[PDB]
Amino acid sequence: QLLQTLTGHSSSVTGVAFSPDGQTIASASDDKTVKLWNRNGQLLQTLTGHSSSVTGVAFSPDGQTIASASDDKTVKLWNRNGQLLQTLTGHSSSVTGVAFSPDGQTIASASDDKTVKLWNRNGQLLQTLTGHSSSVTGVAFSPDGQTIASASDDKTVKLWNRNGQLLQTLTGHSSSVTGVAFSPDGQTIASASDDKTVKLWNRNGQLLQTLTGHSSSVTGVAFSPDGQTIASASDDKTVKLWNRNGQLLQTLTGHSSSVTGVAFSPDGQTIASASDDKTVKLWNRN
Ligand SMILES: [Cl-]
Ligand SMILES: [Cl-]
Ligand SMILES: [Cl-]
Ligand SMILES: [Cl-]
């Protein structure tokens, strides 16, 4: 059920994240800003500095660092006062996503330059993971931090260890993979794809399930904190909720354009969805 609509961005909203305490929402947007919101929907700050569209946003687990990915080829790190701390340069094309390791001391970035780059918390470039043959669209850490998952326009998910050694390539999607997520218990990987499906995989690389129902590209996927519910965002303007057995639970309609990402609150009580209609919408579990 729709709880709140966050209006303020002047262009498409490309991503959304909850602060670790769940009291602050961060939105990324094509208007070159990240915005920080409260639960009532009141805008708190606007983070300016990127020279192009912002494609993703993430909080460090301690809640003290905000990372933003941008088409200007950089990741920028900010404090909770909206002040710029650092700019991570190195990617040769647009940065499409960013994520913090579970211990918060390593940062992974995905780029259209076909690589994932691993960075220390304080900006040092650690590794460049090469293997994808097209743009990398998203990245995620396993909750034990021992594995990294990367989604790519080359239609695969790749699984890496923290040395940057490629462990698995997940093959099955018919078009670009747009996002990837680990289940909280780490046993399940979910992938979203332009082929209109979500696919569920085990860490041994085996296809478990294909979640069908969306009528356009699936742009993102997320696991509830308890691991029992899957949320999918789609260019068909909806968010869909599924169970671990692939059954469609319910469909969240309300956005007037494509939904670009989705996230659960840390406490599992709220779903946030970002849309090309320039808003973030907050939903309850019912
Ligand atoms: Cl726009
Ligand atoms: Cl490419
Ligand atoms: Cl870690
Ligand atoms: Cl939950």
Residue numbers in the entry: 1 to 286
Authors' description from the paper:
While the space group and packing differ between the crystals, the structure is identical for each protein. The crystal structures also show that the proteins are highly internally symmetric with a backbone RMSD between individual repeats below 0.3 Å. The characteristic hydrogen bridge network in WD40 repeats, between a conserved histidine, serine, aspartate and tryptophan is clearly visible in the electron density, see Fig. 4. Analysing the thermal and chemical stability of the WRAP-T permutants revealed that nvWRAP-T, lacking the velcro closure, is just as stable as the variant v13WRAP-T. While v31WRAP-T is considerably more resistant to GdnHCl induced denaturation compared to the other proteins, its increased thermal stability is not that significant. From this, the fraction of denatured protein could be calculated by assuming the protein is completely unfolded at the highest concentration. When possible this data was fitted with a Boltzmann-sigmoid curve to determine the concentration at which 50% of the protein is denatured and the proportionality constant (m), see Table 2. v13WRAP-T remained stable at high GdnHCl concentration thus fitting the data was not possible. A striking difference however is the stability of the “non-Velcro” variant, the least stable for Pizza but as stable as the natural “Velcro” position in WRAP-T. This may be due to differences between the sequences, as the two different “non-Velcro” variants of Pizza have different stabilities as well.
